[PDB]
Design a protein around this nucleic acid. Sequence first.
DNA 1: AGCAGATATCACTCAGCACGA
DNA 2: TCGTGCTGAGTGATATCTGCTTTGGGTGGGTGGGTGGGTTGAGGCAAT
Lengths: 705, 233, 103, 92
Amino acid sequence: AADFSLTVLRARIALLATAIGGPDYTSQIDPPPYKLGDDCLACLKDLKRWFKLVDDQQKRWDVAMAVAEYRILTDDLLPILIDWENKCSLAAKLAKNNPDHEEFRNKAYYDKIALNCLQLLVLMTWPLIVTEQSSSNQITLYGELKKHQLVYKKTILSMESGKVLRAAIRLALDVIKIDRLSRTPRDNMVLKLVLNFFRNVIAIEPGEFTINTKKSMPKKGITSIDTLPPNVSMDDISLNTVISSFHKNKVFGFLLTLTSSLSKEFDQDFINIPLLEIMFYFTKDVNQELLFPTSAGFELSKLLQKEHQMRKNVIKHTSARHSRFGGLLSIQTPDKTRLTVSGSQALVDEKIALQKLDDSKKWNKRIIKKHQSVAAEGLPNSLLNSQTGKAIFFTESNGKHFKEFINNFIDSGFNILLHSVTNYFTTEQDRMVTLEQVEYLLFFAWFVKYQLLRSKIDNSADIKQVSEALKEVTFILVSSLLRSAYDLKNWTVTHAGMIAFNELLNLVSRTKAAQEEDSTDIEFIVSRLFSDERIQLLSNLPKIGSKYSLQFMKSCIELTHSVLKVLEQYSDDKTLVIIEVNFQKVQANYMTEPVIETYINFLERFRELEDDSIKKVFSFFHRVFVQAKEQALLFRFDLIILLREMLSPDGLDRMSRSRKYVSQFSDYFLARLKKRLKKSPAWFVGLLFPPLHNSEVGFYQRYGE
Amino acid sequence: ELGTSNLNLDARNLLAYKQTEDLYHQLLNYPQEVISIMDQTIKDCMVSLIVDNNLDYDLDEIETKFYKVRPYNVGSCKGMRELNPNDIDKLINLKGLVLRSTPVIPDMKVAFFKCNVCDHTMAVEIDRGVIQEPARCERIDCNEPNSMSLIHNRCSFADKQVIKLQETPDFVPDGQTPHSISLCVYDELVDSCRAGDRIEVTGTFRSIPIRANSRQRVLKSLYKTYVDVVHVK
Amino acid sequence: SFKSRALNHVKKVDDVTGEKVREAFEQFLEDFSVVEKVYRAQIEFMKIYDLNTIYIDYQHLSMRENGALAMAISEQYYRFLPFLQKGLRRVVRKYAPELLNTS
Amino acid sequence: RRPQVKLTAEKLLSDKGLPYVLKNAHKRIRISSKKNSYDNLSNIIQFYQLWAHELFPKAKFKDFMKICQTVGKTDPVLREYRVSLFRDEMGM
DNA sequence: AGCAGATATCACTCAGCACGA
DNA sequence: TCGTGCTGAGTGATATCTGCTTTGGGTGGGTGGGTGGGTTGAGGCAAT
Ligand SMILES: [Zn+2]
């Protein structure tokens, strides 16, 4: 029944694959040229019909697996496209030699075959998304099809140095050759097909490792999480290879040409969204700091020295003699009871003895983490879930090419693209799905931040290229998106809106720094954006941040920092009217036990953060402790333990400004804590427990008076 | 000046000083803890010399070294036939002839573990030859339980060697087959004496249980004796 | 009708030092010369004859990069060997794309 | 079917517990201006860790802290105790 | 007798709502 | 936006049962090996 039907399907698709065509070995010329079969176009049409009538309408993916099994793509479609592109190039060269010279027959048929091949390529390379309603067959074939997609991408980027990209560019230029008014809907569909092909090629990436949870994990445990096919390495599918291929095949020039003449010589409705998606997939995994840094040897020496210092600090925990030397220690508690520890370090040191006592303990309190698979929502891997510090290692030439492409785009058409996208989306807000919201917000944030960084580095290129972010249409769109995401409890869109808002606040701060008189119109924007509801929302974000992932926390922290920065600067500069803004009221709004908790939680992970995150956290702490005089908040034990960890020799490198901040804060905190303890012995007990909420005594606790 | 670390100490010098007669007796009675204390103190004085003399010598090099002490001349040398259980875990002197020495044996010091899920590495020390493998990943973000793998070639090892010693001819009372004792040497003392060489060894008389079989924690009643050498002459 | 947990490869912690070793190794194999390029020519030689092994003179390594690269490889060869192979493949890809695939 | 050991309010209020901390915690702890900040932090953590160990050996230090947090949030007797303390001190 | 794998029955955490404050 | 239960099913965890096999010796074999042990006595063979 089902198995027999699967066998028939596989046999029929295998016959189709063998009937499409193959290399002609009769000719003595080597390497042999690909030869089209008698019914090549009919075979491609039949394959498309199979795709339509089996893969989609019956909600299965057996056709794609059958196609991948018999290598229909890597052996038939790509060679056909490459050969057609080479024929067109030869024809162009002949025309250059003599315009009347022609070496083409059945040109219409060849173009038809090429177009059908490109359509089938887009069909096979379309992103795969698994939902809750997906059938059992669709769920079961996810990983294998993702691996086949990885193979497809590797072949596309490698074969003939990626000439199928040039074939697609030629197909698009065929449509570009006719005027906008003369452009039929078919031509616009072809353009959208080419753009979708490029987006799919960039998007593909390794999938997730899905494991059944029915049974508690065995005593063996997890071996490894590998989704790569047998003969595919991360070097083949990395963005580095994509950049190399695009530069070699002049894809960047075609995209720049499309995005520079956007909304002027083209129909924007077809092209705006594909360009936005292409650029988001381009710049989703790229950190902008890396783009503005032999030097490799110098960095290697510095890293080796860092590891040497870490090893030196580790050495104090190792015994000079072998393990079986057998030294036994007895340590006396304040009461006359002796505890036993083993190890030379125990005898020679006391802190080591207590650390070993702690470490030796078997019982662990359960830690429950709320993990959400990104594949569940259909989103791709991006900055939201990528671990902080994950760096895309570009080569020098590839990095230069990517920077040049981004700079040209930002100086050519970022303004127009943002305007068109914002208009189209605000016209059709409700139809938005989570993917489109995240995509728009992340693209906006990334490009704004990159322009800010380049403006800082280079005095020429300036904010006027990204000035369209300031305009109120985009601002209100972003605000509505973030607020709705908050209200509906959609945390991923919340995160994206958070990032976008942080970038917008940094931008507005820079514009105000530029010129005040020209920034009166931006004082208007500042007044609009700091609306009481918005204030409330922004304040609430941190309080909830503690529940979610690390990245959530970091975005919360950064947005808080930006909000306080703008609030203080604009209160000092002039008066603010939303309802007048009382900076102290907001500040106070920011002072509660959840916020602090959040901060603490974020700081616990200090071995992965940079110095900027620590600087922001301790700036907040300074605001709390000194400016606000809300010291009772910080008289906790989580902070004390974490600060011991930070200041310990094994925790943080001595030669670091972060350690300077930590040491200064620790000095001040210890001084004030000593004063409080001298005043009220009760605080010794108090330290252990959350604040009291008692009318009688609450004040006393909080402020000591 | 020479960059070496091992220090040779004459136990009689402790008796030559009023303060350290108790220390000498303790070393004779409790050698392991006293030796560890002596090593740490030697390192402390070595660093303090540079600290006080504000010399130009690099301190980081000193901080990363391991220092040891090699006491000798701890009393009259006993015989392999006069070692009773009362001498267990005590410092002894023994003269004999070397008969054989096994090749260098790698002895584990620090264990290196790797997470199978996040590529996170951590080093855990070894106590009494017991590897303290984590129950779960130490990373907050990655709390994956029971996913730690031991990378054998990235761990820290030490040098060990077993030597067989025979009593000197004069120690045989009547002319029977001379008895033999097993010696263990670590680090610099390895390859410090070849076969057929007459040597004097200072070490700790130790006893170790022997497992009945390889499957089980079951132990033999009878214990095996050997010497943990600390100085070879 | 089932409970399923997903793990991602983007959560993994990278070895920053190892990557820099790969970066330094790529430069050494691509720019070292004694005046024709030594290892660029050797990679070409393996391409024609379809050879696997590539021979590097340790004396040459110590010259470039002040000796930091040579010293790092000497102490930690087991740790850094996988990263050296990553660097070699990248250089092979740029100049001998067909060498990656077996004959 | 074995009762687990928990840091109950009962425990906290016993002679070995909060009253122990109040009786002798200023004598053992000392924050020195002539000492490094890390040293003072380690001294405070040392005192509280030994007290915790004495009180409740099952848990680690940090775990202990967490447990303390939850207990204090939940238990109404503990709350009473705390309030009592505070009140008595405010009356002095 | 001891050891390694497995079943199943034992609690505990975050989840969220009704009252009142 | 704190406090105090009542509900709750999910996510554990740890207190709790179900099947080898072993020593060494042919009362497991030679399609488990002879570098994991046994192993002294007779017998046939080549170099001497
Ligand atoms: Zn991990």
